[PDB]
Design a protein around this ligand. Structure first.
Ligand SMILES: O=[N+]([O-])c1ccc2nn[nH]c2c1
Length: 300
């Protein structure tokens, strides 16, 4: 059975997965995505160092392949992350002039979103902007532009493609009592009250064993910021316990504004954390206990 069709039957938008061209052309990934998933995200091909490795030199072959394959196979597309400190080329993190970095950020955002205008459901515009204590992360954008970079990024993205849902995403938002979780909620409330167009919060759920249960309290706390949507992104669970996975799926089902869930790849050997066997399909592309548990859960 298809977890995407089953989750749609429960009123959600999608069950999605990260992928890219060389997964689609190898293994059984294309077959499984076609059958079982409803949305795809670029695993690496929308990283800043993948798409703009030197200033104004844009590389879109990888992302084009993903977008075209998704359109051909009737899948939704999410993409990101436009502004974050990861996968940033040196040419960007060596900029010290505020106006230059603002326009470099804006051109990166606008060029990518314009190319795929109207084809992308969800864009992750700002990522990993928070420290663990809830203060803003001192990345090049904060250091050179200041805290206005976040409103600027979102405004720029809304202008480039007003059809896209625009998200802020972060990790370690998996416990309701953790400072980072309350902090992103507080800032997103205040940004939106000021007119900043943040449509969603995305929770990057790279989980340890037993952390699924806590998401049942954390996800509702995130939804309390009042964004139109929240989502679960980058999901994997060390050990891939059925209990952990079913708890995360149920958190999504419990939160009205949660639109769907994206897993961090299809089969275990293609995970960055392969030793931890954290995904829903094994090295022979068979559905694992966690996949079948999700099916059972989704089937007062
Ligand atoms: O949910 N995802 O797996 C995922 C993967 C890569 C991304 N880049 N921006 N947002 C992302 C989400």
């Amino acid at each position: 059975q298809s977890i995407d069709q089953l989750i749609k039957a429960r009123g959600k938008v999608y069950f999605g997965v990260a992928t890219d061209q060389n997964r689609l052309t190898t293994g059984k990934n294309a077959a499984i995505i076609k059958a079982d998933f409803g949305m795809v995200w670029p695993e690496n091909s929308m990283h800043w160092d993948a798409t703009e490795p030197s200033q104004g030199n844009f590389n879109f072959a990888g992302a084009d392949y993903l977008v075209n394959w998704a359109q051909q196979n009737g899948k939704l597309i999410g993409a990101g992350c436009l502004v974050w400190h990861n996968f940033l080329p040196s040419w960007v993190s060596s900029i010290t002039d505020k106006n230059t970095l603002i326009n470099v950020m804006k051109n990166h955002i606008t060029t990518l979103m314009t190319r795929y205008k109207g084809k992308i459901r969800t864009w992750d515009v700002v990522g990993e902007a928070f420290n663990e204590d809830g203060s803003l992360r001192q990345n090049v954008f904060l250091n050179v532009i200041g805290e206005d970079y976040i409103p600027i990024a979102f405004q720029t993205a809304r202008a480039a493609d007003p059809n896209a849902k625009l998200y802020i995403m972060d990790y370690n938002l998996d416990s309701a009592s953790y400072p980072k979780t309350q902090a992103i909620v507080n800032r997103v409330k205040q940004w939106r009250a000021a007119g900043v167009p943040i449509d969603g919060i995305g929770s990057q759920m790279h989980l340890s064993a037993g952390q699924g249960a806590g998401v049942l309290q954390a996800l509702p706390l995130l939804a309390s910021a009042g964004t139109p949507e929240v989502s679960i992104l980058m999901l994997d669970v060390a050990g891939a316990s059925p209990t952990d996975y079913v708890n995360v799926v149920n958190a999504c089902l419990n939160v009205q504004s949660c639109v769907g869930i994206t897993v961090m790849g299809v089969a275990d050997p293609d995970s960055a954390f392969a030793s931890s066997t954290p995904l829903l399909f094994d090295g022979n592309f068979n559905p694992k206990p966690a996949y079948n548990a999700i099916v059972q859960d989704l089937q007062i």
